[PDB]
Design a protein around this ligand. Structure first.
Ligand SMILES: CCC[C@H](CC)Oc1ccc(C(C)(C)C)cc1NC(=O)c1nnn(-c2cc(OC)c(OC)cc2OC)c1C
Ligand SMILES: CCC[C@H](CC)Oc1ccc(C(C)(C)C)cc1NC(=O)c1nnn(-c2cc(OC)c(OC)cc2OC)c1C
Lengths: 278, 282
């Protein structure tokens, strides 16, 4: 049994997730596609994937990427368009949350700047297939091509998928990650921290009310440990992606705002999206 | 051996084939691709498209491979715009091939149109056979490949034609001689100079027959010429079948390029074939 606010808190996060997560990716359209230095290449080989695109008629386009030999940056324009679409649903997810919109406009930008990558990877894990190693995104599919676990990103997705979390546990991780008080640029550190502690208490209470099996022992502490690991991966890959942008500019205008390439003035797209409605 | 006129007859056909056959399909660009998105009229159309089912493969300069798996069953009309662009590109190379031949230029412009109107499909299949892989079942057109999908395929005469013709393992000179015999068919609709085209076709047949006698062993290729003539006869029937299959599909779903509309009878001999007439002047 959870308190009435804990029940209300989960139902709002669940309602916000349903309204702002295009799990079928049907509204993802107008995306770039592949046409018909030593420190950089070591990272891209781990996340090498093949792109599949199913059609409403039943046809299947399949893209096998070129081998290792300006060929490792062919999928990045598409992945930038995909990451931007995912984050636009993340922004809408934050706007629906009542505790988020009541924050100052600068804190809303600072929180989304620090949780952009983390909240996308949590939503990506829900469409990740453990056996096939494929992120099934409705019309689109991303299939990979023992040693991969050395890459923290792939290792994070396999460990998180192994926990077999509920929808409520996924959206609570998004709330705990979004309401991080120690993000760069946050002013209301104390108010955001108070909000984060309530999401953690709600997550801890939910697990005790629905997970009696021994496979889920210490599950709350595992989740909190995964959120810390995901925070480190965020710092690694955000620093890594700036090197690729430095050599081959590929980021969309919204991704450029999130990287640093007044807050409301240099984050014009993010400011406009926070003022717009559903 | 071969007579000096027959030797020069092969040299001209080989020269015409070399100048007009983009064997690597390097100049085939700007083509359409399948996008990322009464009752007896359709019933007869579905039977035609399910016969030949191929998957499209696109190799890239960097090493990437785009692959298109066709759908099942207005969904079976996804590959037609691409094949219309491929056929038109092949037709233009066939027209240029005939224009290089001196025996073809001396014919009236109407007989040139009539011969090209009846042998356009046949000469493309002969060129397509040279890039067909019997083992993999794929037409390798350089960066483009067309792999078939399921004796299940021998039922269609078109696929059976390519496998039987490939088994003969014909030379380049024998292939280009088949094109001349097929191009100079005197019994095409609209042909006027029946005797010239018939005598010209007989000389190409004699040259092809004499070429086999002088460049092949004695007992092994004793009937190779008659096998070739049988394949040309079978190929003429496939042309009549395919031409009728395309008119039914075009009537329901227009996909024909302007050049294909003229060669197939869709809307004087030069009044209804203005595009084909212009390509013969230049
Ligand atoms: C389902 C597709 C995804 C998949 C899920 C983990 O994974 C990838 C797999 C392969 C590749 C290759 C290009 C190497 C082939 C990439 C990814 N993955 C990504 O391309 C990516 N995933 N997240 N982000 C990202 C997003 C952000 O917010 C918009 C952000 O903040 C601005 C920073 C980000 O990166 C540090 C990217 C660029
Ligand atoms: C391009 C590869 C060589 C192959 C030889 C028979 O070809 C075709 C392959 C596939 C198709 C489908 C429409 C069934 C996809 C047609 C052709 N064949 C023509 O597209 C054609 N050939 N002559 N006229 C047409 C419309």
């Amino acid at each position: 049994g959870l308190t009435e606010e804990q029940r209300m808190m989960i139902r709002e996060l669940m309602d916000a997730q349903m309204k702002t997560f295009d799990t079928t990716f049907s509204h993802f359209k107008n995306f770039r596609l592949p046409g018909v230095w030593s420190q950089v290449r070591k990272d891209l080989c781990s996340l090498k994937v093949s792109l599949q695109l199913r059609g409403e008629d039943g046809s299947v386009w399949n893209y096998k990427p070129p081998a290792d030999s300006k060929e490792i940056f062919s999928l990045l324009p598409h992945m930038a368009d995909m990451s931007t679409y995912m984050f636009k649903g993340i922004i809408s997810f934050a706007k629906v949350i009542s505790y988020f919109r009541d924050l100052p406009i600068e804190d809303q930008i600072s929180l989304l700047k620090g949780a952009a990558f983390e909240l996308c990877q949590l939503r990506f894990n829900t469409v990740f297939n453990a056996e096939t190693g494929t992120w099934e995104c409705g019309r689109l599919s991303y299939c990979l091509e023992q040693q991969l676990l050395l890459e923290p990103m792939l290792k994070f997705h396999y460990m998180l998928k192994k926990l077999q979390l509920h929808e409520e546990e996924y959206v609570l991780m998004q709330a705990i990650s979004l309401f991080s008080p120690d993000r760069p640029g946050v002013l209301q550190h104390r108010v955001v921290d108070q909000l984060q502690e309530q999401f953690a208490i709600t997550l801890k209470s939910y697990i005790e009310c629905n997970r009696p099996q021994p496979a889920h022992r210490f599950l709350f502490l595992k989740i909190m440990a995964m959120l810390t690991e995901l925070r480190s991966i965020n710092a690694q890959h955000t620093q890594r992606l700036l090197r690729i942008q430095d050599i081959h500019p590929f980021a969309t205008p919204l991704m450029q705002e999130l990287f640093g390439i007044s807050l409301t003035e240099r984050h014009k797209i993010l400011h406009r999206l926070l003022q717009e409605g559903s």
